[PDB]
Amino acid sequence: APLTYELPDETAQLKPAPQPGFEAAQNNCAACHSVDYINTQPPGKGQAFWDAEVQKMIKVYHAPVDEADAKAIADYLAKTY
């Protein structure tokens, strides 16, 4: 038989917020990787940092995220992280 490997259960979650970007990020930013990528970035980086992360995901990695959601998500991240 082949050999196999078992990963532990994934538990990483985004920080809740009332901004609509929270839900948008839940629905878009876990599709390729766990959200611990986001949770562990340097803190209080601000708007330009998070705008650039979101744009990179869309333009470089081809994340299928529309313009309104891209703004909502970046705004949520900059306010929350």
């Binding site: 390729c32 340097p42 470089v60």
Partner: protein, 373 residues
């Protein structure tokens, strides 16, 4: 219980348990990025398989592999394309062994100031192992490299979740690939490769940052041009200057692929705020570089005002961690300990940290405050 805090902002991390591994520092789960607790580096010059750090880029890592069916394909600008089994590699080519450090390009990124995006690592994305396998030179010679070859590309079993995301493929110069040190490794510390360290085969590229050390390696292509894949063309770029550095907040005007390690050293038997007995205090640690040889390690107990020569431990090879020991007289009170290595071509460590946008290649002189009583 189950978390640690690394010594920089937003440093909390879960301690996580993977099959065949001891508890490690969980950076990401999908795909796995796992960092080694610093305490491990004081436990011996060779990093145990169960402690060895893990880094991947794409979530689609293999989780079922039939080692009998596995084939390494050698193709492109070669006279005879090859499809090699693990049994072929083990039996048809004499084996080589090398003790070599693997270190992530962004090891220590969390300490970079101003902070930069990416993997927020402390110093535990490095490890030293005894690798055994076949020199790439021997396999390429069997295939027959054609005149005009320029580079060799390397790809593995992992892939992206969505196919538009660029596949993880790296390249070496043909002259590097055929140098006899670059290795197709099927064994790590006397065992088959741990799963997350690239079972059943990986590229080992001694003295080069870890991005080149392609895991689950199944495709080697000899090409007559520079490879323009994303992970060579766009990712893993450093400033094209001696310091591989820019003014904080400024982008480089020119870049090249990341390449050889810079010189690093650490004191492993004490950490910030540790207690030591005033008097003669034994210190020990490690140093390493791109494979030129560590010439000396100097140690200070007064924040770099004066230095004492450490005694280097017997070596395990030019690509290994080099152990060192020093016994320093410490008066009662606080002391800022530092260690600083140099290599056989005069490379050393800066006293003040430099910066680049990706937070690669950190090698500043490490300082550790201790309390002598």
């Amino acid at each position: 219980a189950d978390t640690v805090t690394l010594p920089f902002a937003n440093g909390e991390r879960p301690l996580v348990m993977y099959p065949g591994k001891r508890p490690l520092i969980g950076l990401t789960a999908r795909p796995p990025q796992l960092e080694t607790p610093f305490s491990v580096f004081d436990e011996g010059l060779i990093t145990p398989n169960d402690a060895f750090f893990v880094r991947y880029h794409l979530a689609g890592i293999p989780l079922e592999i039939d080692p009998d069916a596995f084939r390494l394909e050698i193709k492109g600008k070669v006279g005879t394309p090859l499809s090699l089994s693990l049994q072929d590699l083990k039996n048809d080519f004499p084996a080589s062994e090398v003790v070599a450090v693997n270190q992530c390009s962004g090891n220590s990124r969390g300490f970079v100031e101003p902070r930069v995006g990416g993997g927020q690592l402390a110093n535990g994305a490095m490890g030293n192992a005894r690798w055994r396998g076949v020199p790439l030179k021997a396999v390429l010679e069997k295939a027959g490299v054609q005149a005009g070859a320029k580079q060799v590309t390397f790809g593995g079993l992992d892939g992206p979740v969505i196919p538009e995301t660029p596949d993880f493929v790296k390249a070496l110069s043909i002259d590097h690939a055929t140098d006899g040190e670059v290795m197709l490794a099927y064994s790590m510390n006397g065992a088959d490769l741990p799963w997350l360290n690239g079972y059943p085969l990986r590229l080992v590229v001694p003295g080069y940052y870890g991005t080149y050390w392609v895991k689950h390696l199944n495709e080697i292509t000899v090409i007559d041009k520079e490879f323009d894949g994303f992970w060579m063309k766009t990712a893993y770029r450093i400033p094209d200057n001696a310091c591989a550095c820019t003014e904080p907040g400024k982008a480089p005007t020119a870049t090249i692929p990341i390449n050889r390690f810079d010189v690093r050293s650490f004191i492993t038997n004490v950490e910030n705020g540790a207690s030591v007995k005033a008097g003669e205090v034994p210190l020990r640690g490690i140093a390493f570089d791109g494979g030129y040889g560590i010439t000396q390690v100097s140690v200070s107990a007064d924040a770099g005002k004066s230095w004492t020569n450490a005694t280097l431990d017997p070596g395990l090879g030019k690509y290994s961690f080099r152990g060192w020991k020093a016994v320093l007289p410490l008066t009662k009170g606080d002391h800022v300990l530092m260690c600083r290595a140099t290599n056989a071509r005069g490379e050393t460590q800066p006293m003040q940290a430099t910066w680049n946008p990706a937070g690669y290649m950190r090698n500043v002189v490490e300082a550790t405050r201790v309390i002598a009583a």
